[PDB]
Amino acid sequence: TLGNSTINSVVAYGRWPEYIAVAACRFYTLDTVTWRKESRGWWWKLPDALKDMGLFGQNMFYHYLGRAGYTVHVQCNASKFHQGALGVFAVPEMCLAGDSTTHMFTKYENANPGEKGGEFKGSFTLDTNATNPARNFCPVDYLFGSGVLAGNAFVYPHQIINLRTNNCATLVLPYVNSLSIDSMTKHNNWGIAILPLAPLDFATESSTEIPITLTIAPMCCEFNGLRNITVPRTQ
Amino acid sequence: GLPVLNTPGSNQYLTADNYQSPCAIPEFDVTPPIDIPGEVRNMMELAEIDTMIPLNLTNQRKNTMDMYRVELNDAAHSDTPILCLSLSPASDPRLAHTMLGEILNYYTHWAGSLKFTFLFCGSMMATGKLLVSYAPPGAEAPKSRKEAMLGTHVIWDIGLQSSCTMVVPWISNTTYRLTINDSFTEGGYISMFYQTRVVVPLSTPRKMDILGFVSACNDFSVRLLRDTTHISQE
Amino acid sequence: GLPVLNTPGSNQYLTADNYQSPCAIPEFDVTPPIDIPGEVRNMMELAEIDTMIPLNLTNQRKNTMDMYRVELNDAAHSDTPILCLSLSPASDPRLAHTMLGEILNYYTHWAGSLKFTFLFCGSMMATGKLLVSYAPPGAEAPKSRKEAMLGTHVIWDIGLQSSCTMVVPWISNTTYRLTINDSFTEGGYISMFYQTRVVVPLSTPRKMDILGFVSACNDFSVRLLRDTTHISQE
Amino acid sequence: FCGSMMATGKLLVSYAPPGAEAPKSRKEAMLGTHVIWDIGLQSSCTMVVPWISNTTYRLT
Amino acid sequence: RTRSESTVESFFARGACVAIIEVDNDAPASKLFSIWKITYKDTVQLRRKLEFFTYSRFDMELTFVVTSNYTDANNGHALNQVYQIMYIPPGAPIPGKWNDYTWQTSSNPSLFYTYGAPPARISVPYVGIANAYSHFYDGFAKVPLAGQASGDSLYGAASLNDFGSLAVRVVNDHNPTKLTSKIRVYMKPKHVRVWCPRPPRAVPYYGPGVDYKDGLAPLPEKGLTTY
Ligand SMILES: CCCCCCCCCCCCC/C=C/[C@H](O)[C@H](N)CO
């Protein structure tokens, strides 16, 4: 229980979140995504995904500096006759490859999608529109979206949701950064990547879909540098 | 001044030397470190992390996610192997690009035990027993469960538990093996077989996937740092 | 003689080295020092001295004395800013050429609090209240007293006292800021507003001047000595 | 929950103190007090609504 | 069997080439001085080794190997050359000509190397403005604000890895004959601490970021039931 919100667990690097506001930092439920047979994966950025969550987003945009750990709870239930496996990875500094011949050309509005996040692709497509480039991420699942083999992503803090065994995953991420505190609007400290390690299947049904829900609670929150409100440009 | 005599090796630059040099920014006030999570002291700590094995490197599967999945079915029992692996953790293409293999490709000599974990990703209604075997080198690679049973092995009941670990203990004539394909320092064979068949009830998927992970044990060590073949510049 | 081996870096001249050399005038009888007033041990001691800010760098004012004077009047209250400053003490053209800025332009990194003093130079019969605000970076620069009031600020009563100091405390994501214009190490905004208006009786000047001074606080420090851009040779 | 033993699912039960518009979606409900109920784990779930009032008593 | 050679110190205890700076000694198509921005991302081997981790602290040892040659046969002889390597920290004035005043290097550290001497060498401590170096930065230097026109900074680019440049020239007045020189820069991290291990790069690098363009199919073909 954290605040008025209530409900194996993995503590990233064995380090519980710690201090170097209090009401605002509680469990928030993002929009549900649909796991299909042909799904490739999903990603979110923290604190970006929580930027429109009650008082936590207000504190994000009213302060120059902020820091927080997180507790991420992935929820996905199915029957005993379903099969499939998900890998949930927490990546510090989760930089994703772009889609253009120009290096680092992804624009701010696409790098910070919010609680909807983005999806991995099965292959790499190069954006050719030069007059109006998309300037979006093109994260390939087997390259883990950053030019590394997804099979080695298990070096990151992670959990596995095997449908025959468990239906939930819990990751406790401490604040990780080269600084004690940073700008929450400039920098995403954590990334969450969910990849289907084993494809979803249900007997004699090429139609089954099951929901995945993420609930994220910021922890050990600190804010500093109160000023007027930041209003980032949107697309 | 003091009489001195210049020995051979004077004025050479050895890139592996350990010498003092003058500081180009004296009296710099260095930023103190903070307690960042996830500090690493030894590269072996990374080799001791389980990473998924790209076992299914077929023409249509390599360089996709399908290369990580090995398919089982509920067909009748057979003695044909499910998977066959060479115990060459740095030169076998299926182990070379795991975290363990990537670390090994920066060194010339390796020794120590290995850990292979297998995760069954079928329905909860599926049952079956599998045999996982390691054969030390020297004989022909086992092609049936009869030959595989003679080596080290474990029996995995998926119904009882969804993940099973087999430790391959260090057994070598030499004190270290080379990180390349070499007959004199060959490692052996890892094989998987059906002990019984996989059984499912009705209204259940009849095909399912297993996944493989490999890591090093606490007795693992490497020697003779060297450049890798996994990165090149054009 | 003694066996020696010449390591790399031999025979180089590093202008920042610290080595001994032979004395070209041995046995010189050096004149002893006297107790001269005004000795300095640290360049930061010079950066801790208040110097006047050339705030009014307009076309007709720059490179004259008028660039140091900011004019107030007794007009009706408004929320328009009186002055706007970027907290870039080495790269903002209004702070770069103060003593603090001149010292900062010999270094690459700076950290610590700043002190801004404002002196009101009207008649003794003038009254008024002003608002002086610092907004940390990240948001749009405040364009009205409503936005400025949300940041750090002080209220200055000129009738009560003719000089008022606002300390801008050190607030940064990084441990040091760069002495150039850089977005990642931006400092924030300093702004001045009318809290009430300036009121004068009859037979009194209706326009007057304020002056600005800046200095560093005792927690200030700099790093990585470098050449300045404020002097050049042709 | 009175379904079959083969049924699974997670439900969200929320209490919102008064003052704002009544929540019409899970996004608004999640901001108040709430609990997550896993029917597969347990068939009965209790949410305590704690006493939160401006007045010392409410009228019936 | 100890793990002495797999410690983080031993893993990085090598001088790795990171740059080849080319200069010419000629009368003023030539380049009488060169500016190299200090980075380890011009090469691949050291970059891949470092990007096993997210954060790092270390001192740096720089070694300079200088080679030179005549451009034309029997065109004449030359006297031994002296090279100046001046560190220009960010903000210091940048040379614009071979003979401009900036080379006086009153406050910039400078190194004078005589050709034929053993490679030059200096050391610097950990100079990061943050508590550690960032190999990866998932953010922007500027947040674009509503009202701003079409805060457009590049993704991942931040001044936390801005360390200045090296300006390299030949101090000698120009010979009657043209000479070409190359200075190879070798980096060795020392007293290394690292944090947050990452999977190693699997496809060719493309730019200073993590973008990929080519060679996306690294793994070969291998039968499932073949040893
Ligand atoms: C006087 C001759 C020149 C000697 C001075 C050399 C330049 C001073 C060192 C600047 C470079 C700092 C070390 C660089 C560290 C790496 O780039 C970081 N890992 C970046 O993430």
UniProtKB/Swiss-Prot annotation, chain A:
Disulfide bonds: none
Highest taxon of the lineage: Viruses
Protein location: Virion; Host cytoplasm
Signal peptide region: none
Subunit-level organization: Interacts with capsid protein VP1 and capsid protein VP3 in the mature capsid.
Function: Forms an icosahedral capsid of pseudo T=3 symmetry with capsid proteins VP2 and VP3. The capsid is 300 Angstroms in diameter, composed of 60 copies of each capsid protein and enclosing the viral positive strand RNA genome.
Designated name of the protein: Capsid protein VP2
Residues of the full protein shown: 86 to 340 of 2207
